[PDB]
Amino acid sequence: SCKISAEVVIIGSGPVGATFARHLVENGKSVILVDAGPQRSPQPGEHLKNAYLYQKDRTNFSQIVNSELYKLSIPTSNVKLPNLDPSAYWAAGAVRNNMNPKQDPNTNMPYAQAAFAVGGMGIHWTCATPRLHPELERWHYITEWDELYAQAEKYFNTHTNVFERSLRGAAIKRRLEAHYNNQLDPNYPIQNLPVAAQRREDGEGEAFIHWTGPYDILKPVLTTEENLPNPNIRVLPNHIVQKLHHKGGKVEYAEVQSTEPWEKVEIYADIFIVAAAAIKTPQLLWNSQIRPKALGCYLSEHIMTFGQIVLSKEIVAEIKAYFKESPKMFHVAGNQKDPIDIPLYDPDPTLWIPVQKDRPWHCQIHKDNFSYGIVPDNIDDRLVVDLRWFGFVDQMPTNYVTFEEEIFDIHGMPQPTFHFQYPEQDAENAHRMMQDMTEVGLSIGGFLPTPEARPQFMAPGSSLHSMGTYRMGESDDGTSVVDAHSKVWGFDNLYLGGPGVIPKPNGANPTLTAAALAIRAANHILR
Amino acid sequence: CKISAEVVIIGSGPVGATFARHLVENGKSVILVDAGPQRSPQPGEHLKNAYLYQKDRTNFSQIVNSELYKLSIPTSNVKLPNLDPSAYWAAGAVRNNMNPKQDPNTNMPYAQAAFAVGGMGIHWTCATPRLHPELERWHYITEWDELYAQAEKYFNTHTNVFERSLRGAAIKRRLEAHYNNQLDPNYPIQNLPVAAQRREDGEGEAFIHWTGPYDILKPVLTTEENLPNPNIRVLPNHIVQKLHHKGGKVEYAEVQSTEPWEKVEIYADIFIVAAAAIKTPQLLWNSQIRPKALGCYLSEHIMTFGQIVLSKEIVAEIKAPYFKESPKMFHVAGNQKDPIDIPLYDPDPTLWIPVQKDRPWHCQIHKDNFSYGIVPDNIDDRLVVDLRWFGFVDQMPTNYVTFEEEIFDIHGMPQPTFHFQYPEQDAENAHRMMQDMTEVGLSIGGFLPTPEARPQFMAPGSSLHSMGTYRMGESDDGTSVVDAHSKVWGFDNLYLGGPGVIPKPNGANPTLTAAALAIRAANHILRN
Amino acid sequence: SCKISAEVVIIGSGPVGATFARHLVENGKSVILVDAGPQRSPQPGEHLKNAYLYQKDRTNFSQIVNSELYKLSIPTSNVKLPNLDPSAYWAAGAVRNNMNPKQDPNTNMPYAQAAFAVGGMGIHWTCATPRLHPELERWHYITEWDELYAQAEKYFNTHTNVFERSLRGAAIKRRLEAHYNNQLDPNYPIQNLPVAAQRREDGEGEAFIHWTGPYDILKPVLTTEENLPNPNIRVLPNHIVQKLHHKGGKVEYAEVQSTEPWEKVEIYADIFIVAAAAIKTPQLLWNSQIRPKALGCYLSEHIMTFGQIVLSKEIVAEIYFKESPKMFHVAGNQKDPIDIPLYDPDPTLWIPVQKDRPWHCQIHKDNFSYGIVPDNIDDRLVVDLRWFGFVDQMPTNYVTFEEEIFDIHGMPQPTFHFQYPEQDAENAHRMMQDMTEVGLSIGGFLPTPEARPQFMAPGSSLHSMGTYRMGESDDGTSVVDAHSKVWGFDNLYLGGPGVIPKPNGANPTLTAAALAIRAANHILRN
Amino acid sequence: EARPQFMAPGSSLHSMGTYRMGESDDGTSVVDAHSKVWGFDNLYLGGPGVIPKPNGANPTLTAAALAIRAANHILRN
Ligand SMILES: *Cc1cc2c(cc1C)nc1c(=O)[nH]c(=O)nc-1n2C[C@H](O)[C@H](O)[C@H](O)COP(=O)(O)OP(=O)(O)OC[C@H]1O[C@@H](n2cnc3c(N)ncnc32)[C@H](O)[C@@H]1O
Ligand SMILES: *Cc1cc2c(cc1C)nc1c(=O)[nH]c(=O)nc-1n2C[C@H](O)[C@H](O)[C@H](O)COP(=O)(O)OP(=O)(O)OC[C@H]1O[C@@H](n2cnc3c(N)ncnc32)[C@H](O)[C@@H]1O
Ligand SMILES: *Cc1cc2c(cc1C)nc1c(=O)[nH]c(=O)nc-1n2C[C@H](O)[C@H](O)[C@H](O)COP(=O)(O)OP(=O)(O)OC[C@H]1O[C@@H](n2cnc3c(N)ncnc32)[C@H](O)[C@@H]1O
Ligand SMILES: [Cl-]
Ligand SMILES: [Cl-]
């Protein structure tokens, strides 16, 4: 088909896209959810970490991550190999895919990446869903935070009780409480990190976890009270939305490339929503001739420290205590023992220290699966704990993504170009972040002495917590793209979703927050 | 072929030369032997004194790498998973210091030696601290401060070399504030004492004369007539292989001249082995001299190391010297400026925190040249400071070097084999060492984010501060090789020198200490 | 020190410097040999590979090499670390020492290096001393090649018989002869690589070698027939020559920095000679206000392929210290599992440059910055391959010298603009095809990254040439005449590969020493 | 990463012979030429593991052949 329509159209089936669909469909609207990616599960946007094997080997799921993440601007300008056969052909500054010769590496955001899949990053993410600090992180022109957050947490299946029973979790918390010595605000103690996830109930499979994917969010609206699929929602994988066509602040239709069968498609709707995440969202607007002054400016993420540690002998000593009807699930029988003294089904330590007074940064003491700090395959990953601190990045107009007119990316859309540097003001606190992260690590053991696990700042982009590109404000004056209903200045029926909307430097994992503001916009639409 | 002197000293290391200095200066006649070649016009000159090293510190690490030779390289099971099967392979080579009997997991990988007229004393970083009275010294030596004083004179110890460092100040300020008078005021943050001295030669004040064994020998190498002193003779390229002895009197030394390649017998009234931690016991083992304690109580320092880039705050605080009559020494003129805001001739920060109460470890905040943590060639090394903490290693008989009977090293002497592990007791303190080192680093800036400069424990051997192998005691207890006069149990006229003699866990740089005990032994020789 | 003189002054105690001194002193002149470096042996410019340990472990000597070699232009322009604490201070484009913010990396010569030592590179070099191919490599305005070469080989103690008795040398040569199948020119067969070296005669130390250092070259003129040192020669380590002072084409004196004691020194002489090697020589001129148009132009080296191989099982199958068993490192029950006589002389072969083959092959084992064999691997298993290809001398390739930046000696910072000429490209590729086939005929590749077959980055050859090249007339294409004398000057001469004006593949040192002897005769004659 | 080189064992992903076929219950084979396990009525194997013969080619297509064969053997009775 070539022309199709629904009440509402949502570009991007990320967590945020699906949030809109959930709320909108559930309140009687009809929706088309479009994504440029393929569907990587029987059902749309299932979390891929749910598979048995990932339940058994966490470290391995990093390979799925690497497969999901695609760099957005790769500098090609000056690539020269000093040691190539001179008979052989060479040319620098390739432009193919997300190669970009106009990208200065030194103002780049190297690990600015996206995922193109039904589910976006929400089918690989580590599912951490904290709320923003009332005073230090939230902004005031949103009135009903705790209502939205509550509604968001329900949709995401947020939980704190997943790793509650962790023995390592206890052992650490004890040493950290002792380290800090009641210096922390008692409203924000060391505590269990809230996660979009839940322990299973299915017999002995309670040893395993159902992480939340966009699927989980959509599931309730996907079939009627007859198990036949709900007409009010349709999902279109492998549809690159390239252009929004619009006259005088009303959007008429979306120009979309079906990639199989390869055909142009026009999508008409009463309401349009772009949840294509931090960079691809502005890209779509830029390419639709919609360029508010603030677009792709106030580019912001979290400066991060990371490191891994091997547990102290003291801690290991303090623990020696699932799958009682399956001996072979411990990989030994009779005379063979497991030489690792750490219960194999000990729930993973999954702690956080919030952002608080004097601490504009968000600590996670946990173990999850990322592109970096993968534990080697010949080392039992029970030995290790990952640390990830996230610091405030001030939103600045001199930091931005822009879009070339004569270069295009892998979707054949304006090639993104970054100009980004960490603001000098946040520098002192970033360093404090590190001092903090180290002390904490060395209180629960010694560092994993691999290069890969050394304590270190990540290169820009690594947080995957990009924000501010399509930020909100109170008026079309002070430079913002959307209003507090996440609606684009000067347009009747165009809305955005995603961390890009956030106008306020923070340290916490932004996805839950973003879903809140979406619900807000969605209510605005229902009214 | 056959020659003699009153005294013979095996090894022209710092410790060897100390003996020679004291012994010759008090009227004895000496032959100093070394298996190595002489790497300077004069014997055992320090190679860091060359102009270029004064200009580029980082580069001197390449001389170090050229001086250091691994002692036991495990070969036992080496197999390449991706080699053409047509090609020939065999694991467990035995050539040179390759050792198929070496278990890697009990090895001391960076146990190395240098074979040169000067030993390690022509590349070393010249740090000469004294041992903590209570925590590091032992009591059966009565005259510490006298010996130390005499040793420091010979080594040309000085604290005033980096005193005027601007970075040195900026750091000390931040560290004093960090610690908040938690340190014992007897052992504050202070200038690390070094066998070295600022030059006086016109603008060459901007440069340093580090101490080599040469500097130690210089006074006794010529008479009061500038003719060379007959009472001292130096023999490079002579591998001493065997000491020949009866009922505890040593008659002569069996030596291989390597050029011209001929056997040599060396007769003497007194023999001294200062061949350092492993080669000294090796020589004895091969001379059929094996007290129970030989190469046992193997000990070094467990080390943390890391490098940091100075905080912006510190750099801001420094904007103020040397080479005023040579502008081109700053590498810029006219419109070109040096974008690094740190006076190019600012003396290097060279600080230490001693070992003290509650702190059984020795901190150095400095910049010097070692095999590891070399700063990249494309980075101005003014940006960086090196951190090296040295922790207590408890001396235990289940840690040892032994010597194979059917394998030989590069000198054709019994191949050394290590069995070494850091004692569980020192574990807690080692970790405290790290917590300390990091906090200190992060107080003066951020880490240099290269893999090579990350904060980390060194693999065993890295300290180059090996000790205990030929340790001293009060009695022929079976727990010691030498007595408190550094003389071998059951022998009239055989003495040892070097860190190997130290029987007492410590954190500090041991060379100065070793030179003390030598002077002591030397007096025992003079006064007997 | 402050003011002194000799008949002749020679800047640089490299091989070439010493050659001049040898010839000049031996024919009755008095000279001062100056070097910016220190002396790293009892006697000046002894070869450091002669030490016992290097005789036992070859691969270890690479550490001396790394200690001798110093990069000349290190690009600093844009260095930025993506993952450094923002609290921490940083600044790009440092200028300190041989750091150079004006150096484009992509036109750089990264491994353009020098050594600063009494002896130069001649106290670490691998001592390979071939002659240039009559037709393909020599130029003909030099009339007495074979005379000069002969005299040079005597001074260098050249020899072909050092590795003659090699069992691996045989086993390889057999397989290579079979590979090529009489398709080489029979005038330039597979044969023993000539080396400035000689097997020792000292008892069982015949198992070892006396490599040639500049010392060996100087030795005959260093003492009189009275065992007193020769007044006609003086050696000055640690003296940076910064400026030659000159009026109307006659050089009066040399401005020199003693580095200890740190004092200015003026050196007056009847004749001046700069043998400071490819880049530092032009630097000194540039800084002395002597800038012929051709200076540091026609920059040229060898494009190189390199690789290492593990010997075939077939070869191993096919294959001195009797009075010292312990020199084989085994006794009683322990045997050496490597089936290759431990004192089997190292295979040291070459294939010349010839018709259809403008490149110089070496099948050997020696010590360089690159392809050091791992610590834990018996280096008898390995053979190194080094092919050297023609680099065409072109004026758009050059080193220049910044006016506002200085190096570690406080002299104009060198800046490279260099690329391999397109014309030599197809032959370079042929070089590789050749090198591979040859390797795989005598075994498989050592599968480490470091030993893979590969082109070296520019500079790696250490065979830089053309920077102060010679010609027949003050054409503007040359710095020196065929007597190695600088256009427009009475009494200034240069020495070193920099003089060579003609693309070649062979190891140029011997050649350079020839042209020096020639210049030296020219100096003696008048 | 792109240098010429031998791969470490396994890299081919072309493993074979583990459950190889033969003509008789010789002790040298697991399955017969109909890819059926010696001494079993109704158990069959499939995959490169069945191949008893050193080769160089990409084995998947081959394996699919032998399967079709076994499948016919199953249909026929
Ligand atoms: C990769 C990752 C991310 C992550 C994380 C751990 C990993 C390994 N941990 C997190 C954590 O613990 N807590 C948290 O709050 N976030 C965490 N993240 C990041 C998180 O996954 C994302 O912030 C979140 O997924 C954002 O969701 P959003 O709905 O904005 O969308 P998306 O998932 O980023 O993907 C958007 C979709 O848009 C489609 N797209 C893009 N452009 C187009 C066009 N032009 N046409 C059609 N479709 C388009 C993409 O295909 C994608 O599906
Ligand atoms: C390499 C190094 C060492 C070092 C240092 C930094 C580096 C890069 N920094 C130091 C520091 O800051 N403070 C300190 O106190 N020491 C530091 N060092 C180590 C210091 O140089 C050594 O601890 C000291 O040099 C040891 O002195 P000693 O006289 O004990 O001998 P040596 O230098 O280790 O070598 C002795 C000589 O003996 C000869 N030898 C060995 N075996 C034989 C046989 N069989 N026959 C003949 N001669 C033999 C060796 O050739 C060597 O020259
Ligand atoms: C490093 C190396 C080089 C080498 C080789 C292997 C290695 C590891 N193998 C070779 C081979 O097999 N065959 C061959 O022909 N050459 C090989 N080489 C290179 C060879 O060593 C050089 O070709 C040769 O050494 C160059 O001789 P030259 O006399 O031209 O001098 P130099 O040794 O390069 O350095 C001369 C001296 O000049 C002094 N100097 C420099 N600047 C100044 C100033 N301004 N003032 C005073 N003295 C100065 C240097 O200190 C140096 O000593
Ligand atoms: Cl792998
Ligand atoms: Cl005591």
Residue numbers in the entry:
A (entry chain D): 2 to 322, 327 to 532
B (entry chain B): 3 to 322, 326 to 533
C (entry chain A): 2 to 320, 327 to 533
D (entry chain C): 457 to 533
Sentences from the paper on this structure:
Herein a bacterial pyranose oxidase from Oscillatoria princeps (OPOx) was biochemically characterized in detail. All-in-all, the results show that OPOx is a true pyranose-2-oxidase, resembling the fungal POxs. In contrast to the fungal pyranose oxidases, OPOx could be well expressed in Escherichia coli as soluble, fully flavinylated, and active oxidase. It was found to be highly thermostable (melting temperature >90 °C) and showed activity on glucose, exhibiting an exceptionally low KM value (48 μM). Elucidation of its crystal structure revealed similarities with fungal pyranose oxidases, such as being a tetramer with a large central void leading to a narrow substrate access tunnel.
In this study, a novel bacterial POx from O. princeps, dubbed OPOx was discovered, biochemically characterized and its structure was elucidated at a resolution of 2.6 Å. It marks the first reported bacterial POx crystal structure. According to the Pisa web server the interface area in the crystal structure between subunits A-B (C-D) is 4000 Å2, and A-D (B-C) is 785 Å2, while between A-C (B-D) it is 685 Å2 with a Complexation Significance Score (CSS) score of 0.63. In total, an area of 28,070 Å2 is buried upon tetramerization. OPOx’s monomeric subunit displays a typical GMC fold with a Rossmann fold flavin-binding domain and a substrate-binding domain. Similar to other POxs, the substantial central void directs to a narrow substrate channel that is regulated by a substrate loop, which is crystallized in the closed conformation and is hypothesized to rearrange to an (semi-)open state upon substrate proximity. However, in the determined OPOx structure the substrate-binding loop is closed and the Oγ1 group of Thr127 is pointing toward O4 and N5 of the FAD. His125-NE2 is indeed covalently bound to the 8α-methyl moiety of FAD as observed in the fungal enzymes. The FAD is further surrounded by hydrophobic residues and the catalytic residues His470 and Asn514 (the His-Asn pair). Inspection of the crystal structure revealed the presence of a salt-bridge forming glutamic acid (Glu69) near His125, which appears to push the histidine into a different conformation than observed in the bacterial POx-like oxidases that contain a non-covalent FAD.
